[PDB]
Design a protein around this ligand. Structure first.
Ligand SMILES: Cn1cnc(Cn2c(=O)nc(Nc3cc4cn(C)nc4cc3Cl)n(Cc3cc(F)c(F)cc3F)c2=O)n1
Ligand SMILES: Cn1cnc(Cn2c(=O)nc(Nc3cc4cn(C)nc4cc3Cl)n(Cc3cc(F)c(F)cc3F)c2=O)n1
Lengths: 301, 301
């Protein structure tokens, strides 16, 4: 029993993390087969970072301008190119610990594990959700640029996030491994605001099911609600509207607990309207929205 | 910026995890050099688990009764012994991925990373604190017996926890890697209750400092309190009493933020007395006590 924010074991990704230095600018890269992937921001000098023209900056470089270090061993760069906001450095050595992998883009509301890294050295691991506004509420300091986020299915690592920058609100923004930003951001050292966010309703409901599976039932009630009547309440509390396709995804959890989705919605409607009255759900005093239905099924039984 | 429950990268430990089977009973083991460490409970048949005499059970076994599997390769057992509640199986192959390691026992209030594992296969990673009552609020299902908890300093893995059992309240109990239980528990399949718990005051204060470092300041105030006047409030709210040695450990955080420890205590005293009034601290609506001062310094700047 128990329910915790839990990341995937990070070993498969740790073995791929390298340091990339261009002049005096340094950050983390991802070494898969004979290619290192990293934020193209590394080719900026201090005076290029505010308003870079990356095509200009890159044509002015050659392979020998890139220092790649996999622990103590220097990897020799033998080719370089740009794909959107990621730099690809072809190296002379294929990574012998390359896992089976994919580059997948995730949807808002989905979760992934972040391996925070500094100077090519992994530092910590934790779960994150892609917010509806395409930021993530991570934990990152200077030097974390190029840290990656991922999910692991069986033996295959699905890379979904490369960390670029911190926004002024303290939330974090990045790209997929094709270099395409999540959300309306650009890789410049200028202050950029996130759009308005909203709460991921299906995740909250999934978490309430996790709570019932784990014995918290004080919030249940005899009432049911209609899909449209719940959505009137959701709109008032900045929860995203609930659809039948979402009622569908909650099917297995509704079956395990024997609590109808629309019944669980009546509980959520009451919690939103009344608060929690000094009690807790799975050790939290607010409604948690960063667990997917899959996270619940993976962790409960 | 940001503050998250964050585990150590688990790769060094993943490479040590094996499956140990004795007859039909199976669980996880820890393979370091040419020794596998695992809960001695594995030598119990279904009918031995309620009231085992382990010395009896073990003398009735030979090396060939133990099946150890490191992934696909079977490790040959060439010796076996008991140390308290852990079995040590000497194998014919030294683990080529043995990290630099120590066996250390931790104190209540301290944190460690748990690598949850099933059938010798790592499943997830998350942070845990040793509660004052020597349980941990983990996330474990059937088959997790033998999962380990650890901290990593530089390159050295300090193993501090081997998971044994789940108590009826849903909390988890285990031993250090010498087989000595944390808390008043025994490795029998009988229902055992945890003693009364209490809140880890210095961790709450450390977390409030983390919040100030990260820009939550609404809970600060112009007041100070005396060490004894705070402790009268702490005793009323089941917080453990605060000592000068604890004021001392919070020194660096008090210096970074410029907020005196006893000033921060006046904030905590108010929060305990008034609640939080609909606001949050670092995304939580209750006072978090599972971050040590070291966890805060490791993650903030
Ligand atoms: C506080 N924080 C939270 N997350 C981050 C991530 N992050 C980072 O690690 N580094 C950045 N700028 C650099 C400065 C360098 C100085 N040297 C010697 N080398 C450096 C490398 C970088 Cl990458 N930035 C800022 C930033 C990085 C970008 F990739 C980008 F497109 C715009 C930006 F403003 C950063 O956010 N820091
Ligand atoms: C729900 N939960 C949360 N944590 C745990 C940990 N845990 C476990 O994984 N297994 C246990 N009993 C076994 C049954 C087996 C059946 N087969 C085929 N093999 C088995 C191996 C075990 Cl170890 N237990 C119970 C338990 C394990 C002990 F080590 C102990 F000393 C007393 C106990 F009651 C368990 O708690 N399950």
């Amino acid at each position: 029993s128990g329910f915790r924010k839990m990341a995937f074991p990070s070993g498969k990704v740790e073995s791929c993390m390298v340091q990339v230095t261009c002049g005096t600018t340094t950050l983390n890269g991802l070494w898969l087969d004979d290619v290192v992937y990293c934020p193209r921001h590394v080719i900026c000098t201090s005076e290029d970072m505010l308003n870079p023209n990356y095509e200009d900056l890159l044509i002015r470089k050659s392979n020998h301008n890139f220092l790649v270090q996999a622990g103590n061993v220097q990897l020799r760069v033998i080719g370089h190119s740009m794909q959107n906001c990621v730099l690809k450095l072809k190296v002379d050595t294929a990574n012998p610990k390359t896992p089976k992998y994919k580059f997948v883009r995730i949807q808002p509301g989905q979760t992934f594990s972040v391996l925070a890294c500094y100077n090519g050295s992994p530092s910590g691991v934790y779960q994150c959700a892609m917010r509806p506004n395409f930021t993530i509420k991570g934990s990152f300091l200077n030097g974390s640029c190029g840290s990656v986020g991922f999910n692991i299915d069986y033996d295959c690592v699905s890379f979904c996030y490369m960390h670029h920058m911190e926004l002024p609100t303290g939330v974090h923004a990045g790209t997929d491994l094709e270099g395409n930003f999540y959300g309306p951001f650009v890789d410049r050292q200028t202050a950029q605001a996130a759009g308005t966010d909203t709460t991921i309703t299906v995740n909250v409901l999934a978490w309430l099911y996790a709570a019932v599976i784990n014995g918290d039932r004080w919030f249940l009630n005899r009432f049911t609600t209609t899909l449209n009547d719940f959505n009137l309440v959701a709109m008032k509390y900045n929860y995203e509207p609930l659809t039948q396709d979402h009622v569908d995804i909650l099917g297995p959890l509704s079956a395990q607990t024997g609590i109808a989705v629309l019944d669980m919605c009546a509980s959520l409607k009451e919690l939103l309207q009344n608060g929690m009255n000094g009690r807790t759900i799975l050790g939290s005093a607010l409604l948690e929205d960063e667990f997917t239905p899959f996270d619940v099924v993976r962790q409960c039984s």
